[PDB]
Design a binder for this molecule. Sequence first.
Ligand code: HEM
Ligand SMILES: OC[C@H]1O[C@@](CO)(O[C@H]2O[C@H](CO)[C@@H](O)[C@H](O)[C@H]2O)[C@@H](O)[C@@H]1O
Length: 212
Amino acid sequence: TTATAGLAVELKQSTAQAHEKAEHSTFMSDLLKGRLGVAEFTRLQEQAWLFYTALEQAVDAVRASGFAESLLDPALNRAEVLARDLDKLNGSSEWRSRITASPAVIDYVNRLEEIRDNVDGPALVAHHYVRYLGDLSGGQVIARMMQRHYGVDPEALGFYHFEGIAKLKVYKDEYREKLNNLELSDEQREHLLKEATDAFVFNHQVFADLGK
Ligand code: HEM
Ligand SMILES: OC[C@H]1O[C@@](CO)(O[C@H]2O[C@H](CO)[C@@H](O)[C@H](O)[C@H]2O)[C@@H](O)[C@@H]1O
């Protein structure tokens, strides 16, 4: 890992091992190869609604503070569209009163709520990068596989569609440019990098708990 090439590159390299671990978790691997089904995908999306809700509250806090404002684009917010997807997948709003956070999600949500409470800009950016750039990347493959293997209606995959964003690759390139332009102290940078690994660790455990 190097830091002489900018934060975007340092992040990518520093978290590469943790990304591989999350991406290849047994649950996700089985889901994408067609071994599971829409029920398991819905369970994942229910857990995701819980942590996206926490994430987006933290994003609102940090954006309001003035830190990384241009990076924290509200067009990225997923909680509302995800709730609409869940309404479709489950057939009603029943899920809202039924779902419960897995142990993994309890931990993940707790950390996001701590970031929100502390208004910890560097830590929030780490979590924002891990989730949203993942959605704009691997997420696109997930959406296609839900349609292909399980026949999920595209209208129940709004989470992955990012209404309001035109060119996707251009958007990611601009996102990385914004990361590179963030004014961070060495301590803040170190904190952001460590947190990004922790974000991937939380995500792997979410998949593990779904697999149980
Ligand atoms: C919760 C799980 C996941 C998270 C958090 C995550 C996160 C990320 C992030 C943050 C990037 C951006 C890397 C960068 O340019 O700095 C990324 C890229 C990518 N991810 Fe993952 N990812 C996950 C799951 C997956 C899955 C399951 C796959 C396999 C479909 C995948 C395939 C890719 C690919 C191929 C890229 C490169 C960019 C692209 O081709 O669109 N990811 N992911
Ligand atoms: O590309 C996403 C992400 O995957 C990592 C491992 O987490 O790299 C692997 O996948 C790449 C293709 O997507 C390969 O080019 C690479 O050689 C392989 O290790 C990360 O480095 C990368 O950001």
